């Protein structure tokens, strides 16, 4: 009905060798081998990102979609990818980490990037249930995808849900995961919550084409509805191929080392 069930549907009607091959065609993918050296070796000095969510934030914060600022709190910070991040930048003082935890679910690691005393990770925190608490900058990175777009609705309306007694707190930066904008009741929240608080929806190149995932950010703006469309668009056009020339690699930024004041 909408182009991104047109995707949804390609998508679950590929070969497992196919979906291989279309899931990095022309995404942009950054190094992750420093990251998995030091993650056995001890070394929380390296300043290697703990997993891809970070160069995805900074993709976002340099073109300021996103200016992190005083007190930041990551809603399913994983790793912590975006509050190691996060920690670097000088507009933010505090970084609070919350995120799920148990089995099947990632553990916060504690690094030594620059700027991890400012880092404070709680695991064992299921989001739907904690309260919301004052913020000046609001991260939420959830959404576990699924073969049925029908579900990815229900997980990505009640992100929206929950997300929104925070954003009622007064911040005013925040960059939020839609898994699945492209379905109708999405878009008509979308809608709804872009009058309230602002912001527009953003593709980031980082993400895989097996998956139609957007960012609800404070920097962007503009019609919902078509910015979903026209990264439904690319998403086609990049199943009907015939030269899989491969993902454009690059380098992750170096987060650095050492305490701030
Ligand atoms: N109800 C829930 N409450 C808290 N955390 C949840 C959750 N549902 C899923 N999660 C957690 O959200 C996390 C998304 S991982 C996001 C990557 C992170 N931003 C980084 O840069 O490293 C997952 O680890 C998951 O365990």
């Given at each position: 009905?909408?182009?991104?069930?047109?995707?949804?549907?390609?998508?679950?009607?590929?070969?497992?060798?196919?979906?291989?091959?279309?899931?990095?065609?022309?995404?942009?993918?950054?190094?992750?081998?420093?990251?998995?050296?030091?993650?056995?070796?001890?070394?929380?000095?390296?300043?290697?990102?703990?997993?891809?969510?970070?160069?995805?934030?900074?993709?976002?914060?340099?073109?300021?979609?996103?200016?992190?600022?005083?007190?930041?709190?990551?809603?399913?910070?994983?790793?912590?990818?975006?509050?190691?991040?996060?920690?670097?930048?000088?507009?933010?003082?505090?970084?609070?980490?919350?995120?799920?935890?148990?089995?099947?679910?990632?553990?916060?690691?504690?690094?030594?990037?620059?700027?991890?005393?400012?880092?404070?990770?709680?695991?064992?925190?299921?989001?739907?249930?904690?309260?919301?608490?004052?913020?000046?900058?609001?991260?939420?990175?959830?959404?576990?995808?699924?073969?049925?777009?029908?579900?990815?609705?229900?997980?990505?309306?009640?992100?929206?849900?929950?997300?929104?007694?925070?954003?009622?707190?007064?911040?005013?930066?925040?960059?939020?995961?839609?898994?699945?904008?492209?379905m109708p009741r999405v878009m008509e929240r979308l809608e709804v919550?872009?009058?309230?608080?602002?912001?527009?929806?953003?593709?980031?190149?980082?993400?895989?084409?097996?998956?139609?995932?957007?960012?609800?950010?404070?920097?962007?703006?503009?019609?919902?509805?078509?910015?979903?469309?026209?990264?439904?668009?690319?998403?086609?056009?990049?199943?009907?191929?015939?030269?899989?020339?491969?993902?454009?690699?690059?380098?992750?930024?170096?987060?650095?080392?050492?305490?701030?004041?």
């Amino acid at each position: 009905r909408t182009l991104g069930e047109q995707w949804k549907e390609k998508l679950n009607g590929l070969s497992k060798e196919d979906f291989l091959k279309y899931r990095k065609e022309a995404i942009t993918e950054v190094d992750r081998s420093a990251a998995r050296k030091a993650r056995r070796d001890g070394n929380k000095t390296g300043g290697h990102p703990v997993s891809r969510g970070s160069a995805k934030l900074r993709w976002m914060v340099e073109r300021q979609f996103v200016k992190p600022i005083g007190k930041v709190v990551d809603l399913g910070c994983g790793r912590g990818g975006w509050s190691y991040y996060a920690a670097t930048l000088k507009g933010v003082q505090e970084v609070r980490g919350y995120t799920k935890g148990g089995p099947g679910h990632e553990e916060p690691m504690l690094m030594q990037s620059y700027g991890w005393n400012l880092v404070t990770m709680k695991s064992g925190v299921d989001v739907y249930y904690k309260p919301s608490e004052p913020c000046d900058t609001l991260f939420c990175d959830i959404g576990e995808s699924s073969s049925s777009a029908e579900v990815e609705e229900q997980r990505t309306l009640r992100i929206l849900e929950m997300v929104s007694d925070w954003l009622q707190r007064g911040p005013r930066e925040f960059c939020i995961k839609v898994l699945c904008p492209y379905m109708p009741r999405v878009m008509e929240r979308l809608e709804v919550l872009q009058r309230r608080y602002g912001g527009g929806l953003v593709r980031v190149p980082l993400s895989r084409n097996s998956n139609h995932e957007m960012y609800w950010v404070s920097g962007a703006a503009g019609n919902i509805v078509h910015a979903v469309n026209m990264t439904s668009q690319v998403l086609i056009g990049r199943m009907e191929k015939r030269t899989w020339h491969g993902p454009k690699y690059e380098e992750d930024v170096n987060l650095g080392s050492g305490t701030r004041a």
